[PDB]
Amino acid sequence: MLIVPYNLPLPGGVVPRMLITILGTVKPNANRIALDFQRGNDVAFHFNPRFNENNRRVIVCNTKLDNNWGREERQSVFPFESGKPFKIQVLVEPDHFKVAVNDAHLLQYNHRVKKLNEISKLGISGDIDLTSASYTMI
Numbered sequence: 001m002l003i004v005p006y007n008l009p010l011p012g013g014v015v016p017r018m019l020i021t022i023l024g025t026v027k028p029n030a031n032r033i034a035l036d037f038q039r040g041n042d043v044a045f046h047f048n049p050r051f052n053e054n055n056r057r058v059i060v061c062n063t064k065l066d067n068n069w070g071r072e073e074r075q076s077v078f079p080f081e082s083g084k085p086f087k088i089q090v091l092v093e094p095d096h097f098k099v100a101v102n103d104a105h106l107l108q109y110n111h112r113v114k115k116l117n118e119i120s121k122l123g124i125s126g127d128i129d130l131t132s133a134s135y136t137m138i
C-alpha cells in the first residue's frame with residue numbers, strides 16, 4: 001500500500017539489466033495511469049495508458065525535454081482493465097526500455113535520453129491503488 005503519486009528514487013540512474021516492477025490495481029472508472037522516468041525536470045520515458053481517448057483505449061509513450069513533449073509513440077494493445085490487478089515490469093536494455101504487463105511483452109521504447117545514469121527518479125501516478133514499486137538487477 002503506497003500513496004499515489006509515488007516517487008521511487010533510482011540511485012545512480014538506470015542501467016541495462018535493471019528491472020523495475022510495479023504492482024497495483026486499476027481503480028473502477030479509471031481514466032489514466034502514468035509512469036514517468038525522470039532526468040531532473042525532463043521525462044526520459046513517459047508511459048501513459050489512457051482509458052478513454054475519444055472512447056478508445058491507448059497507451060501513449062513520449063519524452064519531455066525542456067518542458068516540451070516530443071513525438072508520441074502509440075500502442076493500441078491495451079492489457080489494463082478497470083478494477084483489475086496488474087503487474088508492470090520495465091526492463092532497461094542497452095537500446096530501449098522493454099515493458100511487459102502481466103508477464104506478456106507489451107512494447108519497447110528506444111532511449112532518447114542517453115544519459116541513463118541521470119534518470120534517477122520514477123514517478124507513478126494515475127487512477128490506481130499502488131501496492132508496491134521496486135527494482136532489482138537481473
Ligand SMILES: OC[C@H]1O[C@@H](O[C@@H]2[C@H](O)[C@@H](O)[C@H](O)O[C@@H]2CO)[C@H](O)[C@@H](O)[C@H]1O
Nearest residue numbers: 046048060061062063069070071072073
Ligand atoms: O505526449 C504525452 C503527453 O501528452 C500530453 O497531451 C497534450 C494535450 O493534452 C493533447 O491534446 C495533445 O495531443 O498533446 C499534448 C502534448 O503532447 C499530456 O498532457 C501529457 O500528460 C502527456 O501524456
